[PDB]
Amino acid sequence: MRPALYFCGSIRGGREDRTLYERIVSRLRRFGTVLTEHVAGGDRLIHEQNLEWLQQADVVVAEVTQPSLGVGYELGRAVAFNKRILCLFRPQSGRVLSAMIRGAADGSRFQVWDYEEGEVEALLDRYFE
Amino acid sequence: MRPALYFCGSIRGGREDRTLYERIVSRLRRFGTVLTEHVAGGDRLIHEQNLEWLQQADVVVAEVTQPSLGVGYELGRAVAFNKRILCLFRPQSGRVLSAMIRGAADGSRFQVWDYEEGEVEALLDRYFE
Numbered sequence: 001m002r003p004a005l006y007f008c009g010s011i012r013g014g015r016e017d018r019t020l021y022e023r024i025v026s027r028l029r030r031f032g033t034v035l036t037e038h039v040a041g042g043d044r045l046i047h048e049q050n051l052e053w054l055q056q057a058d059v060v061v062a063e064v065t066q067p068s069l070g071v072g073y074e075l076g077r078a079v080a081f082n083k084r085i086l087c088l089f090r091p092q093s094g095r096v097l098s099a100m101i102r103g104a105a106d107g108s109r110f111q112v113w114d115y116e117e118g119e120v121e122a123l124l125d126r127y128f129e
Numbered sequence: 130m131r132p133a134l135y136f137c138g139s140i141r142g143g144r145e146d147r148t149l150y151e152r153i154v155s156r157l158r159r160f161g162t163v164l165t166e167h168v169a170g171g172d173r174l175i176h177e178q179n180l181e182w183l184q185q186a187d188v189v190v191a192e193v194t195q196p197s198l199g200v201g202y203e204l205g206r207a208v209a210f211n212k213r214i215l216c217l218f219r220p221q222s223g224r225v226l227s228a229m230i231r232g233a234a235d236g237s238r239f240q241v242w243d244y245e246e247g248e249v250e251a252l253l254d255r256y257f258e
């Protein structure tokens with residue numbers, strides 16, 4: 001019925017980019033249904049729901065600037081499902097993207113884009129149009 | 130020829146637990162060959178080598194206290210390979226383990242152990258003997 005875009009960003013890793021994430025999610029809605037956590041014993045259900053969303057998504061979009069086990073885990077499951085993946089990283093003095101994420105990239109099905117906050121809407125438009 | 134144990138810990142996520150990791154690795158050597166990064170354009174090879182180590186390991190051991198994309202990614206690939214997994218977490222004021230890692234646990238093939246530094250050698254002995 002509609003293209004599904006899975007979005008993932010850090011939560012327990014840190015909520016420093018929480019405002020940037022809502023900007024990304026709101027842009028993504030222009031291109032399809034966005035499947036993403038709504039962030040304010042429960043962990044198993046959280047794992048289940050994100051795994052199902054990732055599996056049925058047509059594109060996986062990850063903001064990978066803040067280090068996060070959960071985001072890395074979701075990317076690992078996404079790769080093993082051979083998902084189309086877009087990773088968004090903001091270079092910063094003292095912050096280097098994991099070699100496991102940068103090294104997973106191939107420039108087509110798994111893309112890593114270095115960007116800064118001001119251009120994120122333009123980047124998303126360019127990737128999705 | 131020998132049982133292989135894959136060990137993963139944060140690097141670009143942060144090297145705060147680097148001394149704890151060497152203690153874990155040195156204990157793991159008692160139980161088999163330890164496949165792990167030796168930490169002091171290169172990312173693709175790093176990704177390749179860890180992915181091959183994880184795939185041929187008989188147990189995957191991850192220290193998941195420090196949030197890390199790479200460790201999460203390795204756990205995601207390990208789960209999709211249906212690896213036997215042992216995750217080690219140290220609870221701390223203000224630090225909560227990712228729901229994606231805690232929620233992935235099943236108490237048998239994927240185990241999450243909460244522990245503190247003083248007992249890590251005893252824990253490893255108990256899991257591996």
Ligand SMILES: O=c1[nH]c(=O)n([C@H]2C[C@H](O)[C@@H](COP(=O)(O)O)O2)cc1CO
Nearest residue numbers: 008009010011012013037068070227228
């Ligand atoms: O409460 C939550 N709800 C949720 O959906 N997640 C999923 C989605 C996030 O993209 C990702 C964040 O992982 P982490 O919490 O380790 O930073 O894991 C993670 C948490 C907290 O771990």
Ligand SMILES: O=c1[nH]c(=O)n([C@H]2C[C@H](O)[C@@H](COP(=O)(O)O)O2)cc1CO
Nearest residue numbers: 098099137138139140141142166197199
């Ligand atoms: O230089 C490296 N060598 C290496 O083997 N890795 C692998 C193994 C680590 O267990 C894991 C750490 O990931 P991260 O760097 O995102 O914290 O990724 C990661 C890096 C740096 O990303």
